[PDB]
Symmetry: D3
Subunit: 152 residues, 6 copies
C-alpha cells in the first residue's frame, strides 16, 4: 500500500543534452525502485504551463516555459515505499549549490536554472503531475523478481 | 543523410527484470548516438507476432512470442552514422556465448533465450521495426549541442 | 596501534540475492581499508542466535533469525584506522530511508528489514562478532604495498 | 544439467595487492554467474605444489611457487552454463598483452608473471582445483531469485 | 564574471601513487566545471614553502613540505560558478574521518596526512595559488559546447 | 629496459569538449601504466604542422591543422612494457567504425574525423612525438609503490 506509492521524475532538456539519461535511470534501478512509465518527448508550452501553473503570476514565467520547450524531456514514474520523499533526497537540493556530493544534482550540475531534473514535491502533487504527463494506459504494472529481497 | 540513419533497440523482459535499462541506455549515450524515441510498455502477442513475422515457420516461434509477452519491454530508436551496424557490434553476437567481453550481451548475460536486448538486423528491418513500434508522433527531432564534435 | 582496529561487515541475504557483493567489497578497498577475512556461507540458526543474543526477548527475534537463515551471507573482517566508526558511516543509517546518497544503504536499498549489510556497532562488539564468525586461522595478516601512501 | 557446471577462479597476490577483488567479483555477478564458494587465504607451498604438480619439472617451478606464496589469494567457485569456458573468455589470454580490452586481464594488468587471476582450463581440471582448494562443506547451494530471467 | 571564478585543485603524491588522477579529474568534468590548466610535475620545497607559507609557524610545516616533495603532484585549475566553495564541498572535509561518503576524500582516503588532494580555501587564496603554480601562458581560454545547458 | 618504453597519447579537441579526459586517463591508470608527463594546452598551427608533417602533400591538410587548432588538447606520456603497441590496442582502431566495444574509440566515438584520441604509432614515432610536445624537464621520473605487483 505504502510500497505502491508513486512519484514523477523528469529529466529536463539540459539532462538530455548533457547525456545523463542512462545515469539517472540507473540510480533508481539500483536503489530497488520500480519503473512504472517512461517516454521521450517534446513538451508543448500548453503542457508546460499546466505543469508550472503555480509560477503563473511569478516573474519571468514565459522564460521558463520557453526554456522547457527548447529541448526534449524524459518524464518517468517510479514506484516504491516513500519514493516521493526518498526520490527527492536522491535528486538533492533544488538549488545545485546546496546539493551534496552523491545526490544527482550534487554530482552533475551547478546552477538552479540548469539543474537537469525534476521530482515531485509531495504525494498529492506527484498525483497531479503523473496524470498530466501520462495516460493510465502508459502506466505499466509488473512485479520484479527481486521483490521479496527488497521488501519485508 | 548518412548520419541520420536509425535503428531499433529494445530491452527484453530479462533486461528489465535484471535492472539493466539505464546501463544499456548509458552505453548508447556515451558512444555519441542520439535518442530519437523511447517508451516502457507491455507488448501484446499481436504486436510480437508482427515483429517476429519472419520466424513464423520456426518451431520456437510460439514460445518466443510467449516469452516476449511475459514482462514489460523498453523499445527505443537511436540515430547516428552507421547505427544499425555499430548498434549490432555494441550488443554483441545474438548467442551470449559468442559475445565478447565489452559488448552488452557479453558483459551481462549467458543464454540465447535470455539475451536481454533486441537490435535491428539491417536498415530495411530497422525501418519496419521502427514503424511497427512507434507512431511518427513519437520520433523526436532535436540537435545535440556536441554534434560538431561528433560529426565532421 | 589505532591502524590495526578491526570491524565485522557482513553482506546479508538480500545483498547476495541482489548481486551487491563485488560492489560492497569495492567500496572498502577503494577507501584504503585492508581485507583481513572473507567467506561465503549459509549461517545456522544456532550461529544467528548467538549473533543476536541481546534481541532474544524481542517479539521479532524469531522473524529475524529465520530471515537471516533464508539465504547465504558474506561475513568479512576489515582493518584500518577508525574502521569500526568509519565503516558505519560508509554504510549509512540503519534505516535506508535515513541513509544518504553515497552510502551503501543510501544508494542500494529502501526498507529496514532488507538493508543489505551489517556493520559492528563498536570496538567491543566487533571483537565479539569476529570471534563468533571466524576462527583465528581465518584472519590473514599481510601488508599492502600502498600502506605508506595511506597512513602517515 | 549444463547450468550446474563449476569453475575455479582465483585472484592472485598482485590482484589483492592492487585492490581488484571487488571489481573482479562484480564482473562475474553482473554476468549472471552464481557464487558458490569464496575465501581469503594465504596459500602454503604444499598447497601450491599440488595445484602446480604438472609444472614440477620446469625450471621456473620454484619461482612460481614462491611468488604464489608471497601474498594472500582469493580462491572462489562460480557456477553456470559454460562457466569454465565463458570464464576463460572473460579473463582474457594468459598473456595480458594478448588480452583484449573489456577482459579482466586486458583492462587491469600487463605482464604474464603478474596477471592478477587464475581460471580453470577445463571441466576436468576445475573439478581437481575445487577439491584442492575447498572442502565439500564450503560449497554453498542456493537459488538466485533471478534464475528464471537468466536461463530458459 | 561569477561563472568565471577559478580555483586551484591539486592531486597530492598519495593520490598519484594510488592511481586516483583520472577519477578525480572525472569528478570535476561530470559536474560541469571547465578545465583551465593542468600539469604533472615534481614540486620543489622552494615552491611548497611558498605555497604553504601560511603554516610557517606550525610545527608540522617542515614535514608537510617534506611529504609534499616526496612524489609528483598534479596541480590544476577549474572554472565555473562558485567553484572555490563547490570545489571544497566535492573534496569533503580536510580530515578524511569527517568527510562524508560521496565526496573525494570521503570515498578514497582515511588519514589527514594522506588526504590525496588540495583545494583552494577561498577566492583570495585561489588567486595566489594559481599565480604560484601556473604562468599566465598556461591558463587556457576556451568555450565548452554545452555551456548554455550548464549556465543560463 | 623494455618496461621503460614510452608512448605519446593525446586527447584531441573533441575528447576535451565531450568530457572524456578523466575517463581516458583512468583507463591507463588502472592498467598499471605509468604517467610520465601531462599538460593542457592550445596547440599552435606551427606545432600541428610538424606533428602532422606526413600529411603535408595530402588533400585537405590545412583543414586538419585548422581542426586541431580549434580547441585545447591534452598531450601525455605513459611508460611501461609494450606501451606503444598495447596503448594502440586500448585506443582501438583509428577508424571508430572498426573499433571494438571495450576500446576507448569503441566505447566513445563514431567518425574518423572526430575520433577523440591519438596514440603513437610505433616506438620511433613515439620518440619524435614526445620530443615535439614536451621538454625533457616536463618528463617526471618516479616509482609507483605497486611496481613489484605489476612487473616480475
Amino acid at each position: 500500500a505504502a510500497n505502491k506509492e508513486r512519484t514523477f521524475i523528469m529529466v529536463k532538456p539540459d539532462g538530455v543534452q548533457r547525456g545523463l539519461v542512462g545515469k539517472i535511470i540507473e540510480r533508481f534501478e539500483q536503489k530497488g525502485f520500480k519503473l512504472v512509465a517512461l517516454k521521450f518527448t517534446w513538451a508543448s508550452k500548453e503542457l508546460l504551463e499546466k505543469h508550472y501553473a503555480d509560477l503563473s503570476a511569478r516573474p519571468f514565467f514565459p522564460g521558463l516555459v520557453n526554456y522547457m520547450n527548447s529541448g526534449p524531456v524524459v518524464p518517468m514514474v517510479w514506484e516504491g515505499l516513500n519514493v516521493v520523499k526518498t526520490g527527492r533526497q536522491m535528486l538533492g537540493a533544488t538549488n545545485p549549490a546546496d546539493s551534496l556530493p552523491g545526490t544527482i544534482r550534487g554530482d552533475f550540475c551547478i546552477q538552479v536554472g540548469r539543474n537537469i531534473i525534476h521530482g515531485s514535491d509531495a504525494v498529492e502533487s506527484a498525483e497531479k503531475e503523473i496524470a498530466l504527463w501520462f495516460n493510465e494506459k502508459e502506466l505499466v504494472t509488473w512485479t520484479p523478481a527481486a521483490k521479496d529481497w527488497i521488501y519485508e
